[PDB]
């Protein structure tokens, strides 16, 4: 019936990616899902699925599919996974304990690091309390350690975000990685995205 392709090509090959705290969420519905483009190793540094095996995605059907895009440090890729405890997982992008989907990452030393410093990517390191899964805090409000109206340039009034600063010649884990998280939903609704 439906002969439409999904825009997976325009999510992975997107020209520019957002910061993790402002992570993008794109809906996928009413197409056919060709995952063959993902089984290209030596491109994707990490490709790990939870609740499904990556090798049998083309046989399945879902209510909607969600694609999350953001950039994190290489050492921070490890905590984009259920039940992790780092800064990014606690304050920037939380996955459910019962997460059903795939996490894909690939190195972007080429396109997101410069000899001068690429500080255009930010992350939140200060927050009153952790994020529920799939929450997204986009606020930039001065942070006081004891929860009070905080009006800098006063004391104990602090800013919640921090720039990564990616460099071309630095450690492997200090290099920037681009991440796409695929989420599969399976509601009481008919499945609109299926394989060939």
């Amino acid at each position: 019936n439906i002969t439409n392709l999904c825009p997976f090509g325009e999510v992975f090959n997107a020209t520019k990616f957002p910061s993790v705290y402002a992570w993008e969420r794109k809906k996928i519905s009413n197409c056919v899902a060709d995952y063959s483009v993902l089984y290209n190793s030596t491109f994707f540094s990490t490709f790990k699925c939870y609740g499904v095996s990556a090798t049998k995605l083309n046989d399945l059907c879902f209510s909607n599919v969600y694609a999350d895009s953001f950039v994190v440090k290489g050492d921070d890729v490890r905590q984009i996974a259920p039940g992790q405890t780092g800064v990014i997982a606690d304050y920037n992008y939380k996955l459910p304990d019962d997460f059903m989907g795939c996490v894909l990452a690939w190195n972007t030393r080429n396109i997101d690091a410069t000899s001068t410093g690429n500080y255009n990517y930010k992350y939140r390191y200060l927050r009153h309390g952790k994020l529920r899964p799939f929450e997204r805090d986009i606020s930039n409000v001065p942070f006081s350690p004891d929860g009070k109206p905080c009006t800098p340039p006063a004391l104990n009034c602090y800013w919640p975000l921090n720039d990564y600063g990616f460099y071309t010649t630095t450690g492997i884990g200090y290099q920037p990685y681009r991440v796409v998280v695929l989420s599969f939903e399976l509601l009481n609704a008919p499945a609109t995205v299926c394989g060939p």
Partner: antibody, heavy 124, light 108 residues
């Protein structure tokens, strides 16, 4: 067609409690996040609270947090808003609103169907 | 909270006119702005859903555009049933916030 019938409203003392109800029809209730939007007499639209399809996720506006509680009943295809510690500023017409996209997520959506309103008037 | 403003607060036009209403956010809300219409004494009806997408049943004359912080709602040929108040709403983050509304009334 989708119907959002609302009931519960009335006149209540400051400090009193009040529970609101919204009985739905015309769509698979559990697939859509539900919302409450209130409108004070002569003023604009003010969002109040949301609940996901599961009921696993709920979020409240700062003005009502700590005293309003939102819930849904799958078997009764109904949405509820328990209001406690009411105060005159809460006096508004309360709409029951449906997210158009059938998702277990709550953001980046619109409100495609609105019920007609139940009036809450907090005065002594 | 993200602050939604709308310009102008009031607008007077006639049937057949082209009407253009501005809505602006204090923050990037990407494309997640919705446009609603409310006639006096009745519930809001949804008109535009992701800054540009037209809701089923809404007449073709309505259209929206914009991304980031600047958004616009346009009616190409005004109609007698189009005289109402128009609100914009961001869905990028909770709590959701509405614009103050723009009232469109009959020129006289």
């Amino acid at each position: 067609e989708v119907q959002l019938v609302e009931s519960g409203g009335g006149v209540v003392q400051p400090g009193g409690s009040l529970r609101l109800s919204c009985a739905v029809s015309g769509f698979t209730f559990d697939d859509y996040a539900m919302h409450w939007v209130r409108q004070a007499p002569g003023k604009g639209l003010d969002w109040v609270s949301l609940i996901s399809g599961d009921g696993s996720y709920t979020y409240y506006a700062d003005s009502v947090k700590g005293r309003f509680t939102i819930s849904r009943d799958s078997s009764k295809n109904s949405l509820y808003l328990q209001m406690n510690s009411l105060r005159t500023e809460d006096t508004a017409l309360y709409y029951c609103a449906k997210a158009q996209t059938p998702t277990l997520w709550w953001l980046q959506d619109a409100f495609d169907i609105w019920g007609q309103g139940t009036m809450v008037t907090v005065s002594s | 909270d993200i602050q939604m403003t709308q310009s102008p607060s009031s607008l007077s036009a006639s049937v057949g006119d082209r009407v253009t209403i501005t809505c602006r956010a204090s923050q990037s809300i990407s494309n997640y702005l919705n446009w609603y219409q409310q006639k006096p004494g009745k519930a809001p009806k949804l008109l535009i859903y992701v800054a540009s997408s037209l809701q089923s049943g809404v007449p073709s004359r309505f259209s929206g555009s914009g991304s980031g912080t600047d958004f616009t709602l346009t009616i190409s040929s005004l109609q007698p049933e189009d005289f109402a108040t128009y609100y914009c709403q961001q869905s990028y983050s909770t709590p959701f916030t509405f614009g103050p509304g723009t009232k469109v009334d009959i020129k006289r």
